[PDB]
């Protein structure tokens, strides 16, 4: 530190060992990442293998109950628990680990440990980039998965009545969450979600295009028919003709990148921006501030029985989703709805 | 070349005259860490009170506390 005496302490020894290059880099961020991520992943696997959701949701959700990988989930606690942190020492479980598993505390365990593991992994990105003297754009890009996780698994249930309405960690439970947002929020109609979908699909397009453009604008650089052997990592010159790529895409699509920098950034920028827009939309949904209806079209439909649009059709479909989903999906509401109030079409 | 001299700037000059002055070693970092962990414990206390994960005698934790 600036040719100063810098007498060593235990911190210097700890940093020397933590930042030593091994098969798994630990660093100072490892002390947060590895335990939290390990506990989150292991808790999800443990819950999907052994832990039931029979008392919080009235559902079988583990392999030991007969579920498969698609239908097993670590499920959210009961809605009457609200936004309780569900500590195993907490006033609900009170130290009983088995009843803590039965009460849905494993969901809070997995969610909180996964959140702190995401923080630790972002700190790991920062620490490794600082160790190797690279710019921290990987962590800047990883900010968008963390924004999505925070808004979806924490902010949305915190805005709702309890962790019950958070997504349950599992395949079919995520599908439940998706169909719930459709029926109850009209989340497809939300412009923030539309921007998120545009970002995700444009990023997938950018990945595919790029990769194809690089692989098809390669310089020869060899003699064999396998081009993958014609690249050396220490090679100084480019492997692909940027000029030919630009010519091809300008003459095919009308526009092309001319700057490699700008292209890689754009590939960074599109999915991160899309995920951040979708996170803002989910924050809006946390307060039921939905983009659910177009009021002028609802007025025209109420005053005109001929007027039908696909938007009106989707409103009808959402009403059907809510009515046929509510009794089984929100048991705390205790909805014993007679079939004669369920909206139906004809015959079918 | 020097800056613009003002009476108020002369009055405030000693408060901006020790930039880059540091203590050798770690200084009060241990005391700062103790204060930080105490603040974390305090924030956890109030979070658990307002989450109803911590139940106290006179803390109703509801609108009836307005009574």
């Amino acid at each position: 530190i600036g040719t100063y005496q810098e007498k060593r302490t235990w911190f210097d020894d700890a940093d020397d060992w933590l930042r030593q290059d091994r098969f798994v880099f630990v660093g100072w961020s490892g002390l947060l990442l590895l335990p939290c991520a390990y506990f989150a992943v292991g808790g999800w696997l443990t819950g999907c293998t052994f832990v039931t959701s029979w008392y919080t949701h009235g559902l079988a959700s583990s392999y030991i109950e007969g579920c498969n990988f698609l239908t097993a989930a670590v499920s959210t606690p009961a809605n009457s628990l609200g936004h309780s942190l569900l500590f195993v020492w907490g006033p609900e479980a009170q130290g009983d680990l088995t009843r803590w598993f039965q009460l849905g505390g494993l969901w809070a365990f997995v969610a909180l440990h996964g959140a702190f593991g995401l923080i630790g992994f972002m700190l790991r990105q920062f620490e490794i980039a600082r160790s190797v003297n690279l710019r921290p754009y990987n962590a800047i890009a990883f900010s968008a998965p963390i924004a999505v996780f925070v808004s979806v698994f924490l902010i949305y249930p915190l805005g709702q009545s309890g962790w019950f309405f958070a997504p349950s960690f599992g395949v079919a439970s995520i599908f439940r969450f998706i169909l719930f947002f459709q029926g109850f929020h009209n989340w497809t109609l939300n412009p923030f979600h539309m921007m998120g979908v545009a970002g995700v699909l444009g990023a997938a397009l950018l990945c595919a295009i790029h990769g194809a453009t690089v692989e098809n604008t390669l310089f020869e650089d060899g003699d064999g028919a396998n081009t993958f052997r014609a690249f050396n990592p220490t090679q100084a010159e480019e492997t692909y003709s940027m000029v030919t790529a630009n010519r091809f895409w300008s003459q095919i699509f009308g526009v092309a990148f001319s700057n490699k920098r700008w292209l890689h950034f754009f590939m960074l920028f599109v999915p991160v921006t899309g995920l951040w827009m979708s996170a803002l939309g989910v924050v809006g949904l946390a307060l039921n501030l939905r983009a659910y209806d177009f009021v002028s079209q609802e007025i025209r439909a109420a005053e005109d029985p001929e007027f039908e649009t696909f938007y009106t059709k989707n409103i009808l479909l959402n009403e059907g989703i809510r009515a046929w989903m509510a009794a089984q999906d929100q048991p705390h509401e205790k909805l014993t709805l007679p079939e004669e109030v369920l909206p139906r079409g004809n015959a079918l | 070349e020097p800056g613009i001299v003002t009476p108020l700037g002369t009055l405030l000059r000693p408060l901006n005259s020790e930039a880059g002055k540091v203590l050798p070693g770690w200084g009060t970092t241990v005391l700062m860490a103790v204060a930080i962990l105490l603040f974390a414990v305090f924030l956890l206390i109030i979070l658990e009170i307002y989450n109803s994960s911590l139940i106290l005698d006179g803390v109703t934790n509801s609108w009836e506390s307005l009574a």
Binding site: A14, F87, Q94 | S53, L54
Partner: peptide, 30 residues
């Protein structure tokens, strides 16, 4: 005075200190 929730919270603080000491010992165990 001390509710069962408060007692469990203080014991949880003790357990957190214990596990931080344990991970420090795991770091120094190399």
């Amino acid at each position: 005075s001390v509710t069962p929730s408060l007692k469990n919270f203080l014991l949880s603080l003790v357990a957190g200190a214990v596990v931080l000491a344990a991970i420090a010992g795991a770091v120094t165990a190399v």
